[model samples]
Target: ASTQPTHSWKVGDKCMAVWSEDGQCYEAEIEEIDEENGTAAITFAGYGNAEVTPLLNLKPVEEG
Candidate 1:
């Protein structure tokens, strides 16, 4: 049986990608979406060349 899909944001949405390496937070855009595995491929503004994928820690940035 097929299940209903949930809204998990989409590609190009503003998101915060935190690193598992040292728990660092970086502003990035959702470049790709993987609903099958539930992951979003994010790329930071200046650190896009590092080839990193933030998983299980993708959050929305809070405004002051």
Candidate 2:
């Protein structure tokens, strides 16, 4: 198997998560990290909703 770097983020890291209902991405903050499962608990900004999601499903958000 080929070695691949993990493209992931940790708690407190800002990221974007896709909204399954709208297909739109929302701003979120990483609230928890599960290294063993390569997943994280993210808090949706402006909505106060939190859910466990995979790191691969996250996209880092950059502020300009």
Candidate 3:
């Protein structure tokens, strides 16, 4: 079954996601999304790093 997420996070959506390991935001793209688990898998831009994080650490590059 497929469900909708409260936020507008989708796979391949490019945005700035906060990295808890470094406590900073970086350019990244959503690799995977799980609404029930409430987390998204993202890959850092040009850093070759991937992590699963909650939307609390995920945000758009700019408000639009």
Candidate 4:
């Protein structure tokens, strides 16, 4: 049996990313995507640093 694949957003998509260092979810933009590596470079909103994290660590931002 085979399992379903996970889908990732495009480079310009805005989403919520986990700050593993602080254990918090913040708004971030997908700066780059490396599907082969299952990782993405994200720029956290209101922050200067960018981090390359696993796609699983990112999620769609909820609407209010």
Top of the candidates by TM-score: 4
Q: Cα RMSDs of all predictions? A: 4.0, 3.5, 2.8, 3.7
- Best-fitting candidate, measured by lDDT? 3
Question: Model 4, range 9-34, lDDT digits (tens) per residue?
Answer: 78988778888678888988889988
Ranking by TM-score: 4, 3, 2, 1
Q: Please provide, for model 1 over 1-64, each residue's C-alpha lDDT reduced to its tens digit, 9 standing for 90 to 100.
A: 0322243657777577776566787777788876655666787767663324534567777661
Report clash pairs, candidate 1: none
Off by over 4 Å in 2: 1-5
Clashes of 1: 0
Judged by whole-model lDDT over C-alpha atoms, candidate 4 comes out at 0.79
List the candidate 3 regions with Cα displacement exceeding 4 Å: 1-5, 62-64
Candidate numbers sorted by lDDT from highest down: 3, 4, 2, 1
Model 1 scores a TM of 0.65
lDDT for residue 50 in candidate 1, whole number 0-100 = 32
What are the lDDT scores of the predictions, listed in order?
0.63, 0.76, 0.81, 0.79
lDDT comparison, 3 vs 4, better candidate: 3
Poorest lDDT segment (10 consecutive residues) of candidate 3: 1-10
Clashes of 2: 0
Question: In model 1, which range of ten residues has the least summed lDDT?
Answer: 1-10
* lDDT at residue 32 of model 1 (Cα atoms): 82
